[PDB]
Enzyme design. Structure first.
Site, PDB file in Angstrom:
ATOM      1  N   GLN A 161       0.785  -1.249   0.000  1.00  0.00           N
ATOM      2  CA  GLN A 161       0.000   0.000   0.000  1.00  0.00           C
ATOM      3  C   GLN A 161       0.822   1.309   0.000  1.00  0.00           C
ATOM      4  O   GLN A 161       0.532   2.244  -0.761  1.00  0.00           O
ATOM      5  CB  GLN A 161      -1.010   0.044   1.155  1.00  0.00           C
ATOM      6  CG  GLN A 161      -2.022   1.156   0.954  1.00  0.00           C
ATOM      7  CD  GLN A 161      -3.135   1.110   1.949  1.00  0.00           C
ATOM      8  OE1 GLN A 161      -2.987   0.527   3.025  1.00  0.00           O
ATOM      9  NE2 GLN A 161      -4.278   1.698   1.588  1.00  0.00           N
ATOM     10  N   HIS A 164       1.413   3.669  -3.674  1.00  0.00           N
ATOM     11  CA  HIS A 164       0.658   4.949  -3.677  1.00  0.00           C
ATOM     12  C   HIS A 164       1.500   6.165  -3.879  1.00  0.00           C
ATOM     13  O   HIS A 164       1.076   7.281  -3.624  1.00  0.00           O
ATOM     14  CB  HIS A 164      -0.174   5.086  -2.420  1.00  0.00           C
ATOM     15  CG  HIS A 164      -1.431   4.238  -2.440  1.00  0.00           C
ATOM     16  ND1 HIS A 164      -1.439   2.981  -2.899  1.00  0.00           N
ATOM     17  CD2 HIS A 164      -2.718   4.504  -2.005  1.00  0.00           C
ATOM     18  CE1 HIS A 164      -2.660   2.471  -2.768  1.00  0.00           C
ATOM     19  NE2 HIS A 164      -3.445   3.404  -2.221  1.00  0.00           N
ATOM     20  N   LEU A 198      -4.367  -4.116 -11.805  1.00  0.00           N
ATOM     21  CA  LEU A 198      -3.974  -5.421 -11.303  1.00  0.00           C
ATOM     22  C   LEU A 198      -3.508  -5.346  -9.856  1.00  0.00           C
ATOM     23  O   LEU A 198      -3.648  -6.330  -9.123  1.00  0.00           O
ATOM     24  CB  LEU A 198      -2.899  -6.071 -12.203  1.00  0.00           C
ATOM     25  CG  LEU A 198      -1.407  -5.699 -12.071  1.00  0.00           C
ATOM     26  CD1 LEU A 198      -0.764  -6.437 -10.904  1.00  0.00           C
ATOM     27  CD2 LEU A 198      -0.619  -5.985 -13.335  1.00  0.00           C
ATOM     28  N   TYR A 199      -2.991  -4.188  -9.426  1.00  0.00           N
ATOM     29  CA  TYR A 199      -2.400  -4.037  -8.076  1.00  0.00           C
ATOM     30  C   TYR A 199      -3.454  -3.699  -7.003  1.00  0.00           C
ATOM     31  O   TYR A 199      -3.100  -3.253  -5.931  1.00  0.00           O
ATOM     32  CB  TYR A 199      -1.333  -2.930  -8.099  1.00  0.00           C
ATOM     33  CG  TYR A 199       0.034  -3.294  -7.522  1.00  0.00           C
ATOM     34  CD1 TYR A 199       0.175  -3.780  -6.219  1.00  0.00           C
ATOM     35  CD2 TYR A 199       1.183  -3.137  -8.282  1.00  0.00           C
ATOM     36  CE1 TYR A 199       1.418  -4.095  -5.695  1.00  0.00           C
ATOM     37  CE2 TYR A 199       2.434  -3.456  -7.760  1.00  0.00           C
ATOM     38  CZ  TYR A 199       2.551  -3.922  -6.465  1.00  0.00           C
ATOM     39  OH  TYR A 199       3.812  -4.213  -5.981  1.00  0.00           O
ATOM     40  N   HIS A 230      -6.906  -5.794  -2.343  1.00  0.00           N
ATOM     41  CA  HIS A 230      -7.692  -5.642  -1.113  1.00  0.00           C
ATOM     42  C   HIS A 230      -7.944  -6.905  -0.389  1.00  0.00           C
ATOM     43  O   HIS A 230      -8.069  -6.856   0.817  1.00  0.00           O
ATOM     44  CB  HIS A 230      -9.000  -4.917  -1.391  1.00  0.00           C
ATOM     45  CG  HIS A 230      -8.782  -3.537  -1.898  1.00  0.00           C
ATOM     46  ND1 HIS A 230      -8.705  -3.256  -3.214  1.00  0.00           N
ATOM     47  CD2 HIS A 230      -8.501  -2.353  -1.218  1.00  0.00           C
ATOM     48  CE1 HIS A 230      -8.422  -1.939  -3.362  1.00  0.00           C
ATOM     49  NE2 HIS A 230      -8.300  -1.395  -2.141  1.00  0.00           N
ATOM     50  N   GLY A 275       2.232  -8.444 -13.861  1.00  0.00           N
ATOM     51  CA  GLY A 275       2.825  -7.589 -12.869  1.00  0.00           C
ATOM     52  C   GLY A 275       4.326  -7.472 -13.060  1.00  0.00           C
ATOM     53  O   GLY A 275       4.847  -6.360 -13.132  1.00  0.00           O
ATOM     54  N   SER A 287       6.489  -3.990 -13.010  1.00  0.00           N
ATOM     55  CA  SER A 287       7.211  -3.751 -11.779  1.00  0.00           C
ATOM     56  C   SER A 287       8.683  -3.506 -11.996  1.00  0.00           C
ATOM     57  O   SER A 287       9.230  -2.544 -11.485  1.00  0.00           O
ATOM     58  CB  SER A 287       7.069  -4.932 -10.849  1.00  0.00           C
ATOM     59  OG  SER A 287       7.970  -4.788  -9.776  1.00  0.00           O
TER      60      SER A 287
HETATM   61  C1  HEM Z   1      -7.310  -0.470   5.213  1.00  0.00           C
HETATM   62  C2  HEM Z   1      -6.687  -0.560   4.055  1.00  0.00           C
HETATM   63  C3  HEM Z   1      -7.245   0.002   2.792  1.00  0.00           C
HETATM   64  C4  HEM Z   1      -8.446   0.804   2.546  1.00  0.00           C
HETATM   65  C5  HEM Z   1      -9.453   1.372   3.500  1.00  0.00           C
HETATM   66  C6  HEM Z   1      -8.383   0.910   1.069  1.00  0.00           C
HETATM   67  C7  HEM Z   1      -9.340   1.727   0.366  1.00  0.00           C
HETATM   68  C8  HEM Z   1      -9.069   2.165  -0.989  1.00  0.00           C
HETATM   69  C9  HEM Z   1     -10.033   3.106  -1.613  1.00  0.00           C
HETATM   70  C10 HEM Z   1     -11.306   3.662  -1.033  1.00  0.00           C
HETATM   71  C11 HEM Z   1      -9.487   3.362  -2.961  1.00  0.00           C
HETATM   72  C12 HEM Z   1     -10.089   4.273  -4.017  1.00  0.00           C
HETATM   73  C13 HEM Z   1     -10.699   3.533  -5.205  1.00  0.00           C
HETATM   74  C14 HEM Z   1     -11.486   4.503  -6.086  1.00  0.00           C
HETATM   75  O1  HEM Z   1     -11.082   5.691  -6.142  1.00  0.00           O
HETATM   76  O2  HEM Z   1     -12.502   4.117  -6.729  1.00  0.00           O
HETATM   77  C15 HEM Z   1      -8.230   2.551  -3.002  1.00  0.00           C
HETATM   78  C16 HEM Z   1      -7.426   2.546  -4.211  1.00  0.00           C
HETATM   79  C17 HEM Z   1      -6.323   1.608  -4.402  1.00  0.00           C
HETATM   80  N1  HEM Z   1      -5.988   0.695  -3.472  1.00  0.00           N
HETATM   81 FE1  HEM Z   1      -6.884   0.161  -1.638  1.00  0.00          FE
HETATM   82  N2  HEM Z   1      -7.322   0.346   0.422  1.00  0.00           N
HETATM   83  C18 HEM Z   1      -6.682  -0.238   1.449  1.00  0.00           C
HETATM   84  C19 HEM Z   1      -5.471  -1.019   1.334  1.00  0.00           C
HETATM   85  C20 HEM Z   1      -4.821  -1.252   0.087  1.00  0.00           C
HETATM   86  C21 HEM Z   1      -3.686  -2.187   0.051  1.00  0.00           C
HETATM   87  C22 HEM Z   1      -3.094  -2.979   1.183  1.00  0.00           C
HETATM   88  C23 HEM Z   1      -3.288  -2.177  -1.356  1.00  0.00           C
HETATM   89  C24 HEM Z   1      -2.116  -2.963  -1.815  1.00  0.00           C
HETATM   90  C25 HEM Z   1      -1.441  -2.722  -2.914  1.00  0.00           C
HETATM   91  C26 HEM Z   1      -4.197  -1.236  -2.051  1.00  0.00           C
HETATM   92  C27 HEM Z   1      -4.109  -0.951  -3.468  1.00  0.00           C
HETATM   93  C28 HEM Z   1      -4.929   0.076  -4.081  1.00  0.00           C
HETATM   94  C29 HEM Z   1      -4.481   0.596  -5.379  1.00  0.00           C
HETATM   95  C30 HEM Z   1      -3.320   0.132  -6.206  1.00  0.00           C
HETATM   96  C31 HEM Z   1      -5.459   1.655  -5.611  1.00  0.00           C
HETATM   97  C32 HEM Z   1      -5.537   2.606  -6.769  1.00  0.00           C
HETATM   98  C33 HEM Z   1      -4.882   3.925  -6.323  1.00  0.00           C
HETATM   99  C34 HEM Z   1      -5.266   5.053  -7.257  1.00  0.00           C
HETATM  100  O3  HEM Z   1      -6.462   5.148  -7.626  1.00  0.00           O
HETATM  101  O4  HEM Z   1      -4.375   5.859  -7.626  1.00  0.00           O
HETATM  102  N3  HEM Z   1      -5.113  -0.531  -1.140  1.00  0.00           N
HETATM  103  N4  HEM Z   1      -7.837   1.879  -1.754  1.00  0.00           N
HETATM  104  O1  LIG Z   2      10.382 -11.985 -12.924  1.00  0.00           O
HETATM  105  C1  LIG Z   2      10.126 -12.507 -11.848  1.00  0.00           C
HETATM  106  O2  LIG Z   2       9.757 -13.782 -11.887  1.00  0.00           O
HETATM  107  C2  LIG Z   2      10.231 -11.777 -10.506  1.00  0.00           C
HETATM  108  C3  LIG Z   2       8.959 -11.029 -10.161  1.00  0.00           C
HETATM  109  C4  LIG Z   2       8.940  -9.668 -10.394  1.00  0.00           C
HETATM  110  C5  LIG Z   2       7.832  -8.894 -10.119  1.00  0.00           C
HETATM  111  C6  LIG Z   2       6.692  -9.486  -9.617  1.00  0.00           C
HETATM  112  C7  LIG Z   2       5.459  -8.708  -9.314  1.00  0.00           C
HETATM  113  C8  LIG Z   2       4.230  -9.177  -9.776  1.00  0.00           C
HETATM  114  C9  LIG Z   2       3.070  -8.467  -9.492  1.00  0.00           C
HETATM  115  C10 LIG Z   2       3.139  -7.292  -8.763  1.00  0.00           C
HETATM  116  C11 LIG Z   2       4.373  -6.828  -8.303  1.00  0.00           C
HETATM  117  C12 LIG Z   2       5.538  -7.533  -8.574  1.00  0.00           C
HETATM  118  C13 LIG Z   2       6.697 -10.934  -9.360  1.00  0.00           C
HETATM  119  F1  LIG Z   2       5.562 -11.458  -8.859  1.00  0.00           F
HETATM  120  C14 LIG Z   2       7.843 -11.683  -9.644  1.00  0.00           C
END
Ligand code: HEM
Ligand SMILES: O=C(O)Cc1ccc(-c2ccccc2)c(F)c1
Ligand code: HEM
Ligand SMILES: *[C@@H]1O[C@H](CO)[C@@H](O[C@@H]2O[C@H](CO)[C@@H](O)[C@H](O)[C@H]2NC(C)=O)[C@H](O)[C@H]1NC(C)=O
Ligand SMILES: *[C@@H]1O[C@H](CO)[C@@H](O[C@@H]2O[C@H](CO)[C@@H](O)[C@H](O)[C@H]2NC(C)=O)[C@H](O)[C@H]1NC(C)=O
Ligand SMILES: CCCCCCCCO[C@@H]1O[C@H](CO)[C@@H](O)[C@H](O)[C@H]1O
Ligand SMILES: CCCCCCCCO[C@@H]1O[C@H](CO)[C@@H](O)[C@H](O)[C@H]1O
Ligand SMILES: CCCCCCCCO[C@@H]1O[C@H](CO)[C@@H](O)[C@H](O)[C@H]1O
Ligand SMILES: O=C(O)Cc1ccc(-c2ccccc2)c(F)c1
EC number: 1.14.99.1
Lengths: 552, 552
Positions: free
Chosen positions: B172, B176, B353-354, B357, B495, B499
């Protein structure tokens, strides 16, 4: 105070302070080692034995016309050579970029902030006892006096290489898309965030401006018909901002993508030609693609003109000023099995070195007329009175001034030349010899070595005392020309690496872009790959008049 | 109507319309030829015979732990393998970038406009008879129903691979800084114009904001001491904009570089750890460089934390989520004799893909407590009550949820998952299989092949009718996990290329940046090259607690 003020590390190593009075050089990958990266590794010792000087290489490129005639007609070989100019030249530029006015050390701010021109050599730190580091007197010689003594024109000196006003205004046109200093910020800040050839001078830097310039039918760019001929639209009709003095009637306030091109009819000529060419290519692309809407015609046309520009710029423009019998080639494929960064950032020193005003004559001779600078500037009615054909005819015929050699900056633009000296110093440029070293050139051991003559040299020696305190910009315009050439060593050697990276770092040269479909298929690609200055003018100017960058 | 709606060209060849009902595929450099780039060249025929499948390669990397022990300790070999992983992965990305939401053809606007997330596959044209190109019914299945039938969590499914909350909030925090959607513009637009790892989430996106977070003494970042412990400063004190709900008392309104990190204690935990780190590095650099001013301490520290972040991201975080016995390495030298582009643009599909949740649990278990979502969100006093130490201790202990495998999105964030489906569609994403093909993966021939089970597959087949009409996002979370793994094939294989380009495309990895002096010398460099999640936490959290991304 700064222990790095003396520029002690050689061969592209980086200086770093280690306490108040000590420094340390980092010699990583320089091919050298030791306190100042002066002692060579063995593999390096060999290369410096076999490496021909630039003047030797120049000699070979501008002699043996018989052998080049043969080499130019073996595709295998032409390809091999061009590829070696591209790779060897580009390697002199740091990509990704490194320094700017405010950062003499690598920094994220330096890297991420696109408003700065980048910088081939770090600035001299503010707490250095002298303007060039540690050498010279506390002040550099009065700029007004360097100007008057060795830079101003007494009698016109024509370019021995035959460069004409089509060449001179083309430089001005084309370079004014990536040299756009942001004077509100200061020198060393740029308004061209494209950092390269994006034709914002035709299409505008911002989307908002681009939309005002666009017709929204068939991908085309707004225009007006005056007489029988096509010209750019008015400010009144389009609302695009342009810099015109208050006395200019609204029917002559032409709107092009570069807000400054109203100032000189020379600019406005090329500006009109390129507008016609964009609309030309639109008709071609519509015929190939009746299914295409206005966005696609427009964007594909732009991509096509980006292509033509780089083609014309390498095989006609650089070709001419280089003086080479070897025929330079625009071929992205040459770098597809090579290490190369498809990215660019325009460098202060490149802007600085490209101030080629001695090209300009005393008078602008169009048809039966001889216009003074006063009569010519901000005066588009001249362009209307005579027309494009007569411009191209007359500007092909009119000889431009020699840039190096000294004493050929026209008085009409003395302000501009003094500003160039003053702003260099404002930006804390390093000395001429530090720049020569940086681009693998022998430092000049005397002023008479620099100039190749006695009188200008003796004047400069009375002003700067030490050659190692001589400044880049004045040095470029005063330098000894190559035999019967427009430029000296330094100008070619600094210029070429900046130039070709700007050209080849463009994304349309990257593997994923360089293929027909990017350009609307095979007929679109062909427009790029057969582009030339003659055909640019032939297809767009009444009566297919002859042009060249060269007087006949 | 668009004759390219069917995505006819295979193997990375580009489709182009040639009149209203006909298309043409451009096969340049695809290794294939023919109307649809389906018929392979000979050299290609050999490669596809020798090429192991990703699940084969996965098996080898996750077995033979005895053979890897040896391989990981022969520097020659570890280097050869890691280099192969870097080059083979990166090659799947288009750099410079190509498309965005509005541009299904190459265009200068797509390339120059840094506000758009880029796009690994072109959006489906607006005049295509169906939402995936030409297959399926006029509408995709009701997103609410896809959500409730196969995505929502019934019972908590723990991750088999041991991923814990230090892992989850690390994913997270780190991501971000490059996923910052500009909701005002629309999805598919980004607010992170760095397009990579620049630590703006620590330091701010703009200069204006960065200056407000800075102390301007010893390169340090403003902070406050509450209890004995160092935390980030307040909004009241700094004036930086933060997103807090109106009921949050001013003393708890922490100001960090990313305006959203106030809303979860997990973020604010890492947010604090890095803040301490930046200032820790400042003291070290100050000790090595008493001649250095505030700017340089500050910029050099940031460069170091960019370096530490990449080091930990590769050798701990990816390492863990990959499950390999092979020990991945962060070493920019590997790419110095390789063709590689030191630039990056973050991709919609990468952001899509990332969305991990399902990692999140039903309750957040810190010390003796079990906080619900409602209790946890925007509640930093919890952070203050327990302190960083107990957070690290408890979050190392608590398992995160399995991401693939279906039915593990906690109800508390169902809005978010539905959004994710909805906005994919809004951006005109291509189908799951078109993406699978694009990354060299066998299209799934049935839903039950996708899930590895019968029941979810049945439900999916009732909703979508055809497997070629299945959507990417849902399919990632409902995919058959690898054995005792958190992720399916499609997640890893999409990914990994996005990445490693983001990580290695950073400029600090480029020859001209990667040398000690960039980082204030050899001791500065050493911080980067010995960085790990254990030492990031040991050096900055009271009592050097054990952490890991893995439950013990
Ligand atoms: C308590 C923990 C968390 C809460 C309450 C939460 C909530 C949210 C909410 C409300 C959005 C906005 C989506 C929209 O705008 O429609 C979001 C976006 C996202 N979240 Fe989760 N989230 C949580 C943890 C995580 C975790 C652990 C990841 C792990 C990678 C994650 C990855 C994402 C990504 C990649 C986005 C898109 C960001 C963007 O729009 O620029 N979040 N999060
Ligand atoms: O190339 C590889 O095998 C190493 C590797 C490199 C990056 C990722 C990865 C995939 C999804 C999200 C973030 C990193 C992974 F899962 C593995
Ligand atoms: C009638 C013709 C021309 C006039 C009146 C003219 C005048 C000027 C003026 C007034 C500036 C402003 C710089 C300052 O003091 O801050 C300038 C900049 C410059 N000129 Fe000349 N010029 C002319 C032709 C040329 C030509 C032929 C070249 C050839 C390359 C050239 C190269 C430059 C460059 C590289 C800059 C810097 C632009 C920037 O920083 O944005 N100009 N010109
Ligand atoms: C990049 O593109 C976006 C969208 O195409 C531009 O923003 C649009 O900007 C125009 C102004 O010309 C506005 O009329 C629209 O409302 C904007 N649309 C959205 C949804 O943002 C943005 O200006 C472009 N960025 C740059 C740097 O040119
Ligand atoms: C790039 O750097 C310049 C100057 O270092 C930034 O403009 C400065 O911006 C600050 C506000 O952050 C102003 O107070 C100064 O007056 C500006 N100075 C100059 C000379 O312009 C510019 O904003 C930076 N670019 C980005 C993208 O943040
Ligand atoms: C044999 C004639 C072909 C010459 C091809 C090279 C053209 C430019 O060659 C230049 O020469 C200098 C000295 O060797 C180097 O410093 C430059 O980097 C190199 O690019
Ligand atoms: C010597 C065994 C280790 C090989 C390391 C490769 C790890 C990931 O390698 C991947 O394999 C996939 C299938 O071949 C391809 O789709 C990817 O391009 C490739 O990078
Ligand atoms: C918990 C959120 C509501 C989900 C239930 C209604 C949607 C249909 O979910 C049903 O539930 C069962 C297990 O959940 C499965 O065995 C069925 O196949 C599934 O379709
Ligand atoms: O490498 C070469 O010799 C070709 C070459 C390429 C570019 C330039 C050049 C120099 C100064 C300004 C613009 C281009 C030049 F003078 C020569």
């Amino acid at each position: 105070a700064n222990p790095c003020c003396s520029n002690p590390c050689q061969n592209r190593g980086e200086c770093m302070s280690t306490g108040f009075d000590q420094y340390k050089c980092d010699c990583t990958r320089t091919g050298f080692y030791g306190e100042n990266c002066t002692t060579p590794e063995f593999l390096t010792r060999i290369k410096l034995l076999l490496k021909p000087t630039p003047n030797t290489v120049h000699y070979i490129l501008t002699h043996f016309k018989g052998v080049w005639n043969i080499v130019n007609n073996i595709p295998f070989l032409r390809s091999l050579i061009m590829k070696y100019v591209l790779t060897s030249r580009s390697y002199l530029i740091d990509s990704p970029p490194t320094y700017n006015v405010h950062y003499g050390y690598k920094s994220w701010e330096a890297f991420s902030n696109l408003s700065y021109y980048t910088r081939a050599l770090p600035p001299v730190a503010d707490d250095c006892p002298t303007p060039m580091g540690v050498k010279g007197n506390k002040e550099l010689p009065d700029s007004k006096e360097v100007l008057e003594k060795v830079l101003l024109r007494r009698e016109f000196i024509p370019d021995p290489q035959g460069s004409n006003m089509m060449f001179a205004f083309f430089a001005q046109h084309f370079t004014h898309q990536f040299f756009k200093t942001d004077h509100k910020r200061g020198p060393g800040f740029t308004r061209g965030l494209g950092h390269g050839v994006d034709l914002n001078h035709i299409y505008g830097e911002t989307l908002d401006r681009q939309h005002k310039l666009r017709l929204f039918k068939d991908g085309k760019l707004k225009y007006q018909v005056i007489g029988g001929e096509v010209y750019p639209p008015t400010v009144k009709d389009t609302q695009v901002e342009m810099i015109y003095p208050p006395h200019i009637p609204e029917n002559l306030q032409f709107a092009v993508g570069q807000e400054v091109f109203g100032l000189v009819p020379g600019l406005m000529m090329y500006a009109t030609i390129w507008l016609r060419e964009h609309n030309r290519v639109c008709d071609i692309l519509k015929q190939e693609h009746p299914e295409w809407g206005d966005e696609q015609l427009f964007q594909t046309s732009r991509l096509i003109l980006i292509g033509e520009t780089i083609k014309i710029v390498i095989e006609d423009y650089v070709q001419h000023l280089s003086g080479y019998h070897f025929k330079l080639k625009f071929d992205p494929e040459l770098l597809f099995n090579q290490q190369f960064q498809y990215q660019n950032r325009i460098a202060s020193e490149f802007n600085t070195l490209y101030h080629w005003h001695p090209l300009l004559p005393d008078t602008f001779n169009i048809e039966d007329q001889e216009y003074s600078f006063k009569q010519f500037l901000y005066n588009n009615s001249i362009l209307l009175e005579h027309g494009l054909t007569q411009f191209v005819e007359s500007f092909t015929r009119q000889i431009a001034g020699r840039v190096a050699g000294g004493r050929n900056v026209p008085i009409a633009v003395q302000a501009v030349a003094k500003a160039s000296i003053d702003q260099s110093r404002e930006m804390k440029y390093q000395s001429l010899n530090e720049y020569r070293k940086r681009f693998s050139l022998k430092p000049y051991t005397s002023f008479e070595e620099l100039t190749g003559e006695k009188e200008m040299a003796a004047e400069l020696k009375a002003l700067y005392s030490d050659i190692d305190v001589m400044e880049l910009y004045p040095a470029l315009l005063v330098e000894k020309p190559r035999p019967d050439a427009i430029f000296g060593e330094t100008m070619v050697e600094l210029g070429a690496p900046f130039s070709l990276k700007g050209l080849m770092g463009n994304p349309i040269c990257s593997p994923q872009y360089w293929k027909p479909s990017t350009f609307g298929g095979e007929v679109g690609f062909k427009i790029i790959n057969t582009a030339s200055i003659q055909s640019l003018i032939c297809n767009n100017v009444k009566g297919c008049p002859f042009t060249s960058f060269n007087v006949q």
